[PDB]
Scaffold this active site. Sequence first.
Site, PDB file in Angstrom:
ATOM      1  CE  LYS A  17      -2.916  -2.382   2.357  1.00 44.75           C
ATOM      2  NZ  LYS A  17      -3.852  -2.890   3.396  1.00 44.75           N
ATOM      3  CE  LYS A  36      -1.038   3.352   9.770  1.00 47.13           C
ATOM      4  NZ  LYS A  36      -2.341   4.091   9.781  1.00 47.13           N
ATOM      5  CE1 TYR A  86       3.098  -5.159  18.945  1.00 48.23           C
ATOM      6  CE2 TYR A  86       3.696  -4.895  21.252  1.00 48.23           C
ATOM      7  CZ  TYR A  86       3.544  -5.706  20.137  1.00 48.23           C
ATOM      8  OH  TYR A  86       3.836  -7.052  20.223  1.00 48.23           O
ATOM      9  CG  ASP A 130     -11.851   1.662   6.055  1.00 49.00           C
ATOM     10  OD1 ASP A 130     -12.282   0.920   5.146  1.00 49.00           O
ATOM     11  OD2 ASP A 130     -10.633   1.848   6.263  1.00 49.00           O
ATOM     12  CD  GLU A 134      -9.625  -6.763   6.142  1.00 42.91           C
ATOM     13  OE1 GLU A 134      -9.815  -6.280   5.001  1.00 42.91           O
ATOM     14  OE2 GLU A 134     -10.535  -7.281   6.831  1.00 42.91           O
TER      15      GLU A 134
HETATM   16  N1  LIG Z   1      -0.290  -0.448  15.552  1.00 44.91           N
HETATM   17  C1  LIG Z   1      -0.285  -1.801  15.482  1.00 44.91           C
HETATM   18  N2  LIG Z   1      -0.013  -2.613  16.523  1.00 44.91           N
HETATM   19  C2  LIG Z   1      -0.137  -3.837  15.944  1.00 44.91           C
HETATM   20  N3  LIG Z   1       0.057  -4.974  16.646  1.00 44.91           N
HETATM   21  C3  LIG Z   1       0.337  -6.127  16.003  1.00 44.91           C
HETATM   22  C4  LIG Z   1       0.884  -7.196  16.702  1.00 44.91           C
HETATM   23  C5  LIG Z   1       1.173  -8.384  16.040  1.00 44.91           C
HETATM   24  C6  LIG Z   1       0.913  -8.502  14.679  1.00 44.91           C
HETATM   25  S1  LIG Z   1       1.245  -9.866  13.920  1.00 44.91           S
HETATM   26  N4  LIG Z   1       0.440 -11.068  14.606  1.00 44.91           N
HETATM   27  O1  LIG Z   1       2.654 -10.128  13.999  1.00 44.91           O
HETATM   28  O2  LIG Z   1       0.855  -9.753  12.543  1.00 44.91           O
HETATM   29  C7  LIG Z   1       0.366  -7.433  13.981  1.00 44.91           C
HETATM   30  C8  LIG Z   1       0.078  -6.245  14.642  1.00 44.91           C
HETATM   31  N5  LIG Z   1      -0.464  -3.863  14.625  1.00 44.91           N
HETATM   32  N6  LIG Z   1      -0.548  -2.492  14.382  1.00 44.91           N
HETATM   33  C9  LIG Z   1      -0.858  -1.936  13.174  1.00 44.91           C
HETATM   34  O3  LIG Z   1      -0.769  -0.729  13.020  1.00 44.91           O
HETATM   35  C10 LIG Z   1      -1.305  -2.812  12.042  1.00 44.91           C
HETATM   36  C11 LIG Z   1      -2.629  -2.794  11.636  1.00 44.91           C
HETATM   37  F1  LIG Z   1      -3.511  -1.991  12.257  1.00 44.91           F
HETATM   38  C12 LIG Z   1      -3.047  -3.605  10.587  1.00 44.91           C
HETATM   39  C13 LIG Z   1      -2.135  -4.435   9.945  1.00 44.91           C
HETATM   40  C14 LIG Z   1      -0.807  -4.451  10.356  1.00 44.91           C
HETATM   41  C15 LIG Z   1      -0.395  -3.638  11.405  1.00 44.91           C
HETATM   42  F2  LIG Z   1       0.890  -3.653  11.802  1.00 44.91           F
END
Ligand SMILES: Nc1nc(Nc2ccc(S(N)(=O)=O)cc2)nn1C(=O)c1c(F)cccc1F
Length: 257
Positions: A17, A36, A86, A130, A134
Amino acid sequence: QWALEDFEIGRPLGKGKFGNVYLAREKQSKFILALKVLFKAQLEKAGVEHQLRREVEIQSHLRHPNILRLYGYFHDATRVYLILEYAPLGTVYRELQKLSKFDEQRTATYITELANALSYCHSKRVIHRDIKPENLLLGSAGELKIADFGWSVHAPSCGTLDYLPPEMIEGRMHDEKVDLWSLGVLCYEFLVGKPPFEANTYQETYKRISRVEFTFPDFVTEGARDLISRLLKHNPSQRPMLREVLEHPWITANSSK
Ligand SMILES: Nc1nc(Nc2ccc(S(N)(=O)=O)cc2)nn1C(=O)c1c(F)cccc1F
Ligand SMILES: O=C(O)c1cc(-c2cccc(Br)c2)nc2c(F)cccc12
Protein backbone atom coordinates in the site's frame (compact mmCIF):
# COMPACT_ATOMS: atom_id res chain seq x y z
CA GLN A 1 9.86 17.44 18.18
CA TRP A 2 10.18 14.01 16.39
CA ALA A 3 12.98 12.36 14.37
CA LEU A 4 13.79 8.78 13.20
CA GLU A 5 16.98 8.89 15.37
CA ASP A 6 14.68 8.82 18.46
CA PHE A 7 13.46 5.27 17.63
CA GLU A 8 14.98 1.76 17.57
CA ILE A 9 13.15 -0.07 14.72
CA GLY A 10 12.34 -3.78 14.93
CA ARG A 11 10.24 -6.47 13.27
CA PRO A 12 7.60 -5.59 10.59
CA LEU A 13 3.97 -5.82 11.92
CA GLY A 14 2.23 -5.27 8.53
CA LYS A 15 2.78 -4.20 4.86
CA GLY A 16 1.24 -1.62 2.46
CA LYS A 17 0.00 0.00 0.00
CA PHE A 18 1.56 3.36 1.06
CA GLY A 19 4.12 1.58 3.30
CA ASN A 20 4.78 -0.68 6.32
CA VAL A 21 4.18 -0.72 10.11
CA TYR A 22 7.22 -1.71 12.16
CA LEU A 23 7.63 -2.53 15.83
CA ALA A 24 9.75 0.21 17.41
CA ARG A 25 11.06 1.47 20.74
CA GLU A 26 11.63 5.10 21.77
CA LYS A 27 15.34 5.33 22.84
CA GLN A 28 14.91 7.98 25.56
CA SER A 29 11.91 6.37 27.38
CA LYS A 30 12.11 2.67 26.24
CA PHE A 31 8.37 3.10 25.21
CA ILE A 32 7.36 0.28 22.78
CA LEU A 33 5.13 1.49 19.96
CA ALA A 34 4.30 0.87 16.29
CA LEU A 35 5.73 3.08 13.53
CA LYS A 36 3.65 3.37 10.32
CA VAL A 37 6.09 4.52 7.57
CA LEU A 38 4.17 5.89 4.56
CA PHE A 39 6.03 6.91 1.34
CA LYS A 40 5.40 10.46 -0.05
CA ALA A 41 5.71 9.18 -3.65
CA GLN A 42 2.77 6.66 -3.34
CA LEU A 43 0.69 9.16 -1.26
CA GLU A 44 0.89 11.71 -4.04
CA LYS A 45 0.11 9.34 -6.88
CA ALA A 46 -3.13 8.36 -5.05
CA GLY A 47 -3.82 12.00 -3.96
CA VAL A 48 -4.47 11.00 -0.32
CA GLU A 49 -2.34 13.74 1.36
CA HIS A 50 -5.46 15.71 2.31
CA GLN A 51 -7.14 12.47 3.63
CA LEU A 52 -4.03 11.39 5.72
CA ARG A 53 -3.63 14.89 7.24
CA ARG A 54 -7.42 14.61 7.94
CA GLU A 55 -6.97 11.07 9.53
CA VAL A 56 -4.02 12.23 11.78
CA GLU A 57 -6.02 15.37 12.77
CA ILE A 58 -9.02 13.22 13.89
CA GLN A 59 -7.07 10.21 15.44
CA SER A 60 -4.61 12.24 17.59
CA HIS A 61 -7.50 13.99 19.50
CA LEU A 62 -9.55 10.82 20.27
CA ARG A 63 -9.16 9.15 23.71
CA HIS A 64 -10.93 5.84 24.31
CA PRO A 65 -9.73 2.35 25.47
CA ASN A 66 -11.16 0.80 22.18
CA ILE A 67 -9.59 3.31 19.79
CA LEU A 68 -5.95 2.99 18.84
CA ARG A 69 -3.98 6.03 20.06
CA LEU A 70 -1.85 8.12 17.70
CA TYR A 71 0.94 9.72 19.78
CA GLY A 72 2.35 11.94 17.06
CA TYR A 73 3.95 12.18 13.65
CA PHE A 74 6.90 13.46 11.60
CA HIS A 75 8.33 13.37 8.04
CA ASP A 76 11.66 13.39 6.14
CA ALA A 77 12.74 13.95 2.47
CA THR A 78 10.65 10.94 1.23
CA ARG A 79 8.55 9.47 4.14
CA VAL A 80 5.77 10.38 6.61
CA TYR A 81 5.90 8.57 10.01
CA LEU A 82 2.93 7.88 12.30
CA ILE A 83 3.62 7.02 16.00
CA LEU A 84 0.89 4.56 16.94
CA GLU A 85 -0.01 2.54 20.00
CA TYR A 86 1.27 -1.03 19.62
CA ALA A 87 -1.54 -3.61 19.94
CA PRO A 88 0.35 -6.81 21.13
CA LEU A 89 -2.29 -9.46 20.20
CA GLY A 90 -2.43 -8.51 16.48
CA THR A 91 -5.41 -8.19 14.16
CA VAL A 92 -8.95 -9.62 14.57
CA TYR A 93 -8.45 -10.52 10.85
CA ARG A 94 -5.59 -12.91 11.84
CA GLU A 95 -7.57 -14.29 14.83
CA LEU A 96 -10.53 -15.11 12.53
CA GLN A 97 -8.25 -16.95 10.01
CA LYS A 98 -6.91 -19.04 12.97
CA LEU A 99 -10.28 -19.98 14.66
CA SER A 100 -12.36 -19.79 11.36
CA LYS A 101 -15.26 -18.30 13.36
CA PHE A 102 -16.02 -16.95 16.85
CA ASP A 103 -18.41 -18.11 19.58
CA GLU A 104 -21.36 -15.94 20.71
CA GLN A 105 -19.44 -14.89 23.85
CA ARG A 106 -16.41 -13.53 21.89
CA THR A 107 -18.66 -11.94 19.16
CA ALA A 108 -20.99 -10.11 21.65
CA THR A 109 -17.91 -8.88 23.62
CA TYR A 110 -16.30 -7.52 20.37
CA ILE A 111 -19.65 -5.97 19.28
CA THR A 112 -20.02 -4.24 22.71
CA GLU A 113 -16.42 -2.84 22.56
CA LEU A 114 -17.06 -1.71 18.92
CA ALA A 115 -20.46 -0.04 19.78
CA ASN A 116 -18.82 1.74 22.74
CA ALA A 117 -15.98 3.10 20.58
CA LEU A 118 -18.55 4.14 17.92
CA SER A 119 -20.84 5.95 20.50
CA TYR A 120 -17.74 7.93 21.63
CA CYS A 121 -16.87 8.57 17.92
CA HIS A 122 -20.39 9.79 17.06
CA SER A 123 -20.49 12.02 20.22
CA LYS A 124 -17.63 13.98 18.47
CA ARG A 125 -19.55 13.72 15.11
CA VAL A 126 -16.75 11.46 13.68
CA ILE A 127 -18.01 8.60 11.42
CA HIS A 128 -15.45 5.81 10.77
CA ARG A 129 -16.98 4.38 7.51
CA ASP A 130 -14.15 1.66 7.33
CA ILE A 131 -14.66 -0.89 10.24
CA LYS A 132 -13.30 -4.27 8.97
CA PRO A 133 -11.35 -7.11 10.72
CA GLU A 134 -8.00 -5.90 9.10
CA ASN A 135 -8.54 -2.47 10.88
CA LEU A 136 -9.31 -4.00 14.31
CA LEU A 137 -6.47 -4.71 16.68
CA LEU A 138 -6.27 -6.54 19.97
CA GLY A 139 -4.66 -5.09 23.11
CA SER A 140 -2.70 -7.04 25.78
CA ALA A 141 -5.97 -8.05 27.63
CA GLY A 142 -7.47 -9.08 24.24
CA GLU A 143 -9.62 -5.89 24.10
CA LEU A 144 -10.65 -4.67 20.63
CA LYS A 145 -9.10 -1.41 19.30
CA ILE A 146 -10.21 0.46 16.10
CA ALA A 147 -7.10 1.31 14.05
CA ASP A 148 -7.49 3.03 10.65
CA PHE A 149 -9.23 6.44 10.61
CA GLY A 150 -8.06 7.07 7.00
CA TRP A 151 -11.53 7.05 5.39
CA SER A 152 -13.20 8.85 8.38
CA VAL A 153 -14.87 12.31 7.98
CA HIS A 154 -17.42 14.44 9.97
CA ALA A 155 -21.08 13.34 9.40
CA PRO A 156 -23.21 13.68 7.19
CA SER A 157 -20.65 13.79 4.26
CA CYS A 158 -12.09 2.22 -2.60
CA GLY A 159 -11.20 -1.49 -2.22
CA THR A 160 -13.63 -4.36 -1.42
CA LEU A 161 -17.33 -3.27 -0.91
CA ASP A 162 -18.00 -5.97 1.74
CA TYR A 163 -18.53 -3.55 4.70
CA LEU A 164 -20.10 -0.54 2.89
CA PRO A 165 -23.87 0.11 3.19
CA PRO A 166 -26.27 0.68 0.21
CA GLU A 167 -26.43 4.53 0.68
CA MET A 168 -22.59 4.61 0.41
CA ILE A 169 -22.14 2.23 -2.56
CA GLU A 170 -24.92 4.21 -4.40
CA GLY A 171 -23.11 7.53 -3.60
CA ARG A 172 -26.14 8.89 -1.60
CA MET A 173 -26.07 11.08 1.58
CA HIS A 174 -24.91 9.08 4.56
CA ASP A 175 -24.50 9.69 8.25
CA GLU A 176 -23.82 7.91 11.51
CA LYS A 177 -26.16 5.03 10.55
CA VAL A 178 -23.43 3.81 8.10
CA ASP A 179 -21.38 2.45 11.09
CA LEU A 180 -24.45 0.53 12.33
CA TRP A 181 -24.55 -1.38 8.99
CA SER A 182 -20.77 -2.19 9.40
CA LEU A 183 -21.57 -3.58 12.90
CA GLY A 184 -24.13 -6.00 11.38
CA VAL A 185 -21.58 -7.07 8.70
CA LEU A 186 -18.95 -7.67 11.43
CA CYS A 187 -21.36 -9.45 13.79
CA TYR A 188 -22.24 -11.80 10.83
CA GLU A 189 -18.59 -12.36 9.79
CA PHE A 190 -17.50 -13.04 13.42
CA LEU A 191 -20.11 -15.83 13.79
CA VAL A 192 -19.97 -17.23 10.21
CA GLY A 193 -16.31 -16.61 9.27
CA LYS A 194 -17.19 -14.72 6.03
CA PRO A 195 -19.05 -11.37 5.43
CA PRO A 196 -22.76 -11.70 4.38
CA PHE A 197 -22.41 -10.16 0.90
CA GLU A 198 -19.08 -11.85 -0.06
CA ALA A 199 -18.67 -12.83 -3.73
CA ASN A 200 -16.05 -13.69 -6.35
CA THR A 201 -16.54 -10.20 -7.98
CA TYR A 202 -17.06 -6.55 -6.93
CA GLN A 203 -20.02 -6.38 -9.41
CA GLU A 204 -21.88 -9.24 -7.73
CA THR A 205 -21.06 -7.95 -4.09
CA TYR A 206 -22.58 -4.57 -5.23
CA LYS A 207 -25.84 -6.42 -6.31
CA ARG A 208 -25.92 -8.43 -3.02
CA ILE A 209 -25.51 -5.21 -0.86
CA SER A 210 -27.97 -3.03 -2.90
CA ARG A 211 -30.54 -5.89 -2.67
CA VAL A 212 -29.65 -6.88 1.03
CA GLU A 213 -29.17 -10.54 -0.03
CA PHE A 214 -27.96 -12.62 2.93
CA THR A 215 -28.89 -16.04 4.33
CA PHE A 216 -27.93 -17.36 7.80
CA PRO A 217 -26.20 -20.80 8.17
CA ASP A 218 -27.86 -23.35 10.55
CA PHE A 219 -25.65 -22.60 13.60
CA VAL A 220 -26.68 -18.88 13.78
CA THR A 221 -29.03 -18.57 16.79
CA GLU A 222 -32.30 -16.57 16.83
CA GLY A 223 -30.79 -13.77 18.97
CA ALA A 224 -27.84 -13.28 16.55
CA ARG A 225 -30.27 -13.50 13.55
CA ASP A 226 -32.45 -10.78 15.17
CA LEU A 227 -29.59 -8.31 15.88
CA ILE A 228 -27.92 -8.84 12.40
CA SER A 229 -31.32 -8.48 10.51
CA ARG A 230 -32.11 -5.25 12.42
CA LEU A 231 -28.66 -3.85 11.55
CA LEU A 232 -28.73 -4.90 7.88
CA LYS A 233 -31.70 -2.62 6.86
CA HIS A 234 -31.68 -0.70 3.50
CA ASN A 235 -33.21 2.38 5.15
CA PRO A 236 -30.66 3.97 7.55
CA SER A 237 -33.41 5.37 9.87
CA GLN A 238 -34.75 1.74 10.23
CA ARG A 239 -31.34 0.69 11.78
CA PRO A 240 -31.26 0.83 15.64
CA MET A 241 -29.26 3.31 17.77
CA LEU A 242 -25.99 2.23 19.47
CA ARG A 243 -27.87 2.37 22.86
CA GLU A 244 -30.41 -0.22 21.49
CA VAL A 245 -27.51 -2.47 20.25
CA LEU A 246 -25.71 -2.48 23.69
CA GLU A 247 -29.12 -3.38 25.34
CA HIS A 248 -30.03 -6.19 22.84
CA PRO A 249 -30.98 -9.48 24.69
CA TRP A 250 -28.43 -11.47 22.65
CA ILE A 251 -25.70 -8.89 23.51
CA THR A 252 -26.58 -8.56 27.26
CA ALA A 253 -26.77 -12.42 27.60
CA ASN A 254 -23.40 -13.10 25.94
CA SER A 255 -21.22 -10.04 26.36
CA SER A 256 -19.00 -9.04 29.31
CA LYS A 257 -18.30 -6.20 31.80
N1 LIG B 1 -0.29 -0.45 15.55
C1 LIG B 1 -0.29 -1.80 15.48
N2 LIG B 1 -0.01 -2.61 16.52
C2 LIG B 1 -0.14 -3.84 15.94
N3 LIG B 1 0.06 -4.97 16.65
C3 LIG B 1 0.34 -6.13 16.00
C4 LIG B 1 0.88 -7.20 16.70
C5 LIG B 1 1.17 -8.38 16.04
C6 LIG B 1 0.91 -8.50 14.68
S1 LIG B 1 1.24 -9.87 13.92
N4 LIG B 1 0.44 -11.07 14.61
O1 LIG B 1 2.65 -10.13 14.00
O2 LIG B 1 0.85 -9.75 12.54
C7 LIG B 1 0.37 -7.43 13.98
C8 LIG B 1 0.08 -6.24 14.64
N5 LIG B 1 -0.46 -3.86 14.62
N6 LIG B 1 -0.55 -2.49 14.38
C9 LIG B 1 -0.86 -1.94 13.17
O3 LIG B 1 -0.77 -0.73 13.02
C10 LIG B 1 -1.30 -2.81 12.04
C11 LIG B 1 -2.63 -2.79 11.64
F1 LIG B 1 -3.51 -1.99 12.26
C12 LIG B 1 -3.05 -3.61 10.59
C13 LIG B 1 -2.13 -4.44 9.95
C14 LIG B 1 -0.81 -4.45 10.36
C15 LIG B 1 -0.40 -3.64 11.40
F2 LIG B 1 0.89 -3.65 11.80
O1 LIG C 1 5.86 18.54 2.17
C1 LIG C 1 6.14 17.42 2.86
O2 LIG C 1 7.30 17.27 3.19
C2 LIG C 1 5.03 16.49 3.17
C3 LIG C 1 4.53 16.43 4.43
C4 LIG C 1 3.46 15.53 4.71
C5 LIG C 1 2.89 15.45 6.06
C6 LIG C 1 3.40 16.25 7.08
C7 LIG C 1 2.87 16.19 8.37
C8 LIG C 1 1.83 15.31 8.66
C9 LIG C 1 1.35 14.53 7.63
BR1 LIG C 1 -0.11 13.31 8.02
C10 LIG C 1 1.84 14.56 6.34
N1 LIG C 1 2.93 14.73 3.78
C11 LIG C 1 3.45 14.80 2.50
C12 LIG C 1 2.89 13.95 1.49
F1 LIG C 1 1.90 13.14 1.81
C13 LIG C 1 3.37 13.98 0.20
C14 LIG C 1 4.43 14.85 -0.13
C15 LIG C 1 4.99 15.67 0.81
C16 LIG C 1 4.51 15.66 2.14
